[model samples]
Target: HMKERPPPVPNPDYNSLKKGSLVKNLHMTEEVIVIAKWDYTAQQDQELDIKKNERLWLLDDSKTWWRVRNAANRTGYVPSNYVERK
Candidate 1:
């Protein structure tokens, strides 16, 4: 068996997005999904609510959390485990 990944989309809105790669000045990265609901860290930096099966645009990522953008019109990081690379 084999698995495949899609191409990608380029783009942010609470914190908006961070800058990377310098291409005509744009926010760039991947998209991921929340596998389930999360309470978020006690000191959570993101404003997005924890909801199962929600879509988030990846603005930036790290081992601890993934910076994401959502319908809340904000951008911030979420616990990495709460996210699944899509």
Candidate 2:
């Protein structure tokens, strides 16, 4: 007989995020990744607003597609512009 494995655990609290907050690097152990830009669109497409030191985490979660928060409380994601990495 084949044994079943449990599903992957979902994120802890997706609703705790807020706009205008700064999200730091989640890869401090490996690398330093910072907010480089923002993506805003009326119809969800591949065009982003990239500014230096701008509020990258301000967009609504629905506007943003995927997100990752590190142990140090930094959060970021691939906007609708970029195809999600596997």
Candidate 3:
């Protein structure tokens, strides 16, 4: 008889999963709702200032510095650690 491992199932624990292993391709257009955990001041001209509880769409999740679009359609960078994905 032959035995096979069970297929992979969708899990919300992204912290444990390696990127690109389960996901075939990274969705560049993937949008997520995130709330600012802390009030961040724009350090650079391209960075954005976000207040706590402020919700925004994470445009890119490439690095520590993430690109985001706010409610006003303003796009800029913000520290990934400063926001919590909702």
Candidate 4:
């Protein structure tokens, strides 16, 4: 008889769902401007970048990212440190 290695099993960790899904559409009235000299590019489809000194509508603030609408009227996510209040 011949021996064979077993196939890998998918992770079934349920506690990993603690973060849950994205909380969307919690509109904000704050206007902010980009301070960092970053051309923040998107790795995901729901993300985008902002240029230096460009004003944006801070739609919602999260722990690490803030949802904003650029001058082009396209809504996306950017790093919170990249922008600040008006």
Candidate 5:
């Protein structure tokens, strides 16, 4: 069975666990507006690297990094401050 790859991160590594098991990534729909800029390969834990004016779903922000899912259904971590929901 496929479960918990790269292991679970202590915090800010959300959406990895699902249905009592670790899944590909988390998926939720709130709304995070990414402003300013980005780099696909530059960001850490980068997946679904978003461009400006992109809308994202905030999965978990257990710490400095916030796990997010995008319109493409890809997930990864971006700096907490990189996104805003307020």
Candidate 6:
């Protein structure tokens, strides 16, 4: 008899993010959920573009780096050195 394998896990639904997506930082881990994402090949720096509810999408689970989305729908990369937990 052959062994059975489980199905792969599905990715989270980030497509629900519109212009006013609500994002929160996970308390236990201090990692923020990515309400949106963007390609880093077509934008500029985002660390200095801080505004309310605006956040950078993390590239990995370690939460070391982030890809940010601005109020202008523009996207860019930012280091975790700028993010804070609330």
| Winning candidate number (lDDT) | 3
Give candidate 4's root-mean-square deviation (CA, Å): 12.2
The full ranking of all candidates by lDDT, starting with the best, is 3, 4, 5, 1, 6, 2
lDDT of 5 by residue, 1-86 (tens): 88753333225443455445445565466555443143333334453465655556777666876666776777677654445554
Say which prediction, candidate 1 or candidate 3, comes out ahead on TM-score: 3
lDDT of every predicted structure (CA atoms): 0.52, 0.37, 0.70, 0.58, 0.54, 0.40
Q: Residue 86, candidate 5: how far off, in angstroms?
A: 3.8
Top-TM-score candidate index:
3
Candidate with more favorable, higher TM-score: 1 or 2: 1
Give the Å shift of residue 5 in candidate 6: 52
TM-score of each: 0.47, 0.20, 0.63, 0.53, 0.47, 0.30
RMSD of 6: 13.4
Tens digit of lDDT per residue, candidate 2, span 40-80?
A: 32222223433433333333344445443434455444443
lDDT of 2: 0.37
TM-score of 4: 0.53
- Per-residue lDDT of model 4, residues 8-45, tens digit only: 22221222444666656553566554443345556556
- Candidate 1, residues 6-86: lDDT per residue as tens digits? 322111122445753433466565555444233443243443554556676667664455566667767665666665655
Candidate 1: stretches off by over 4 Å: 1-47
**Clash count list over all predictions:** 3, 0, 0, 0, 0, 0
Better of 5 and 6 by lDDT: 5
Candidate 6 lDDT over residue span 14-81, tens digit each? 33344655465543424344432212222232233444444543334444545544556654444344
Checking candidate 4 for backbone clashes, the offending pairs are none
Model 5 misplaced stretches (Cα beyond 4 Å): 1-42, 45-48
Clashing pairs in 1: 14-73, 14-74, 14-75
